[PDB]
Amino acid sequence: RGWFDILDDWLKRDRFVFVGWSGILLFPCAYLALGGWLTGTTFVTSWYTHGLASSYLEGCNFLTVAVSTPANSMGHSLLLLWGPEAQGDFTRWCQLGGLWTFIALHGAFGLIGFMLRQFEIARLVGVRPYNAIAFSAPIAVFVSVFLIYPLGQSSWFFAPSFGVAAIFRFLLFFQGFHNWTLNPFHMMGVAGVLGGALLCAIHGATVENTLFQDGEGASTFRAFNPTQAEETYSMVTANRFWSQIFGIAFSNKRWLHFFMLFVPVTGLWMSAIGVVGLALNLRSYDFISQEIRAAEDPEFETFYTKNLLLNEGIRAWMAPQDQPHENFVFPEEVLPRGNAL
Amino acid sequence: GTFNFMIVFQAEHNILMHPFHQLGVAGVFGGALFCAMHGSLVTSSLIRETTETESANYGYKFGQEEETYNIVAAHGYFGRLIFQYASFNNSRSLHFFLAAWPVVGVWFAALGISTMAFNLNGFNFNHSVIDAKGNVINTWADIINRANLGMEVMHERNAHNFPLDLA
Amino acid sequence: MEPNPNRQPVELNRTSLYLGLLLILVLALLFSSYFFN
Amino acid sequence: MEVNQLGLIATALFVLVPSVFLIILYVQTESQQ
């Protein structure tokens, strides 16, 4: 009974919050990424990196606070507290955006710690590890968006900043610069997310409305017992209902529940692949054949051509303030505008 | 055409800053999350009825009376993943939650669009943060407004004759 | 020479056919615009 | 429209190659005992 086995005994004790070996990684990294986010959004400015106020201390609200990305001049510097940029000065580290990399890096290692927790608990209780496998999708999204996307770009500055409206800026940046709505990988993502919410809604509603009467109450939640062997709802009735309403229906409960794993997980993976492309500006920006035609035929107009003009407006009107390292001076006469507005 | 509708809508109504849209997002991200979670937990707790050389889906027979997964095992996993009282042990409660979460969230999304139909817009924090002199200190909402302006000045570029876009 | 005992029959049921074809045709319909460009 | 000259063959094979793969596996499943 060595010291490893006694430490393993303690880490795997049945307690209120299970720890585990993964908890050594997970619990400090998650706490710091969470705590770094609250600290930065409560007290930390973005004045020197972005020229923005981003904290409750400066007057922002929950929608507008953020821990913003470091300055573009930092490149992809790890921005360690002891690194050559902050030189151990905590105050300067906060001013240079070191909390962004702190949250991103500890968030990354925490997410690893969380998937390791999923494996560890599934192995201890004796279930298959599909929940960890399904968690690969949010990890793939986090890694592609928060790490691979800025690594492909000029600096961490162009990553998403950890804030509500800051994320909204990230969304509108991707429309205006990348035409990301046109990207078939994003479209697959949308289908997986919306298809996932549909399956969530329809499966929940189908189970609740094909329940067997297992008790006398009109509120039907009491009629379930977790030790029952019997199905609590009628798969046969559900199948007949959906086959007659929609044409097709599930008839295998295992395939149904796998498909529910598969749909949102595949969608998020597809979107991650699209974002990796956008790291290198490999956009699905334009359809070459329409651009050739629109250039030569000034009467050819489509919803795609209209969207490109919207995108040109986004870039011109947002770039001077969104990218203050560039020192864009766009005089009023160069800004694209339609008539009147 | 859908994307054009979305971009112009954001330009004119700041839909991203409207809490009903935000509840819509929580409805759909949560719905996809819960779809993944429920799918994964049920699949993880499937009871062995098949060998390695065949799909585990043949372990279920259509209209069989027995449960095909061990909900006590799944609760025992997920209540150790988070904590015990965070996890459903009642399948009826669990499935109601899977119904109610994306449905209530999408209802808020629909009401968002339908109330921006009457031009009650998302939150406007443009120039909310002012220094001691009175200088505007930009926030992320101010950066959103620049993007919004770019769509607004460019959309329907020949249709407007007067300074305000009123409907 | 004795036959190989690791050989296994392969199956694809009809619903799997319909699902796969749905998948392939929808990916085709989705990506076709990008392939023509 | 001036489209990619390989878009038709790329689309036709992207359809036909995995579709025939699935058809092959379906048909030989049905013929099993």
């Binding site: 097709i248 008839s251 | - | 049921n13 009809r14 045709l25 076709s32 | 489209v3 359809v15």
Partner: peptide, 30 residues
């Protein structure tokens, strides 16, 4: 060619709907 290609793929999908509905493997209670 483009228009024909898109309509062709679409028409195959509609046909697949027809077979998936009217020529499914029948759910059998066992």
């Amino acid at each position: 060619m483009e228009t024909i290609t898109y309509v062709f793929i679409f028409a195959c999908i509609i046909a697949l709907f027809f077979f998936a509905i009217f020529f499914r493997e029948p759910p059998r209670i066992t």
